[PDB]
């Protein structure tokens, strides 16, 4: 039942994790629309590098396209394709 140190260390270490990212964080200059859902699941670097001088950064990226509902005052919902950046590989790098 106790997670051994070796297993905790492996699973916490800097790597791509499913991350729920607010669409406005990816499309900050959208003024016209709000989005449903408001967040999308993306693969993004996360976890720890266990050195305050190291950070977890992507070394390989790609895109994914999703159908998102786009809502505007005084008109029907639209559903349209939107692209998001994915992280495929991460490394602990000096800040």
């Amino acid at each position: 039942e106790v997670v051994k140190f070796m297993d905790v260390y492996q699973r916490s270490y800097c790597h791509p994790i499913e991350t729920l990212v607010d669409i406005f964080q990816e499309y900050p200059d959208e003024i016209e629309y709000i989005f449903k859902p408001s967040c999308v699941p993306l693969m993004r670097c996360g976890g720890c590098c266990n050195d305050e001088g190291l950070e977890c950064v992507p070394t390989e990226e790609s895109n994914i396209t999703m159908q998102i509902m786009r809502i505007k005052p005084h008109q029907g919902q639209h559903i349209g394709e939107m692209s998001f950046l994915q992280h495929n590989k991460c490394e602990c790098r000096p800040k």
Binding site: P16, E18, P41, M43, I64, Q86, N88
Partner: protein, 43 residues
């Protein structure tokens, strides 16, 4: 046994959907656990 295995390979291949690189819930593997038990003394 090889027919059952074909079915289960297809079902397992079906879980990813468009979610390339994404993890899956362990609940979504239960069909396979149950089916591989059903192939022991059977297959």
């Amino acid at each position: 046994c090889a027919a059952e295995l074909a079915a289960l390979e297809a079902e397992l291949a079906a879980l990813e959907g468009p979610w390339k690189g994404y993890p899956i819930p362990y609940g979504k593997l239960q069909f396979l656990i149950k089916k591989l038990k059903q192939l022991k003394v059977a297959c």
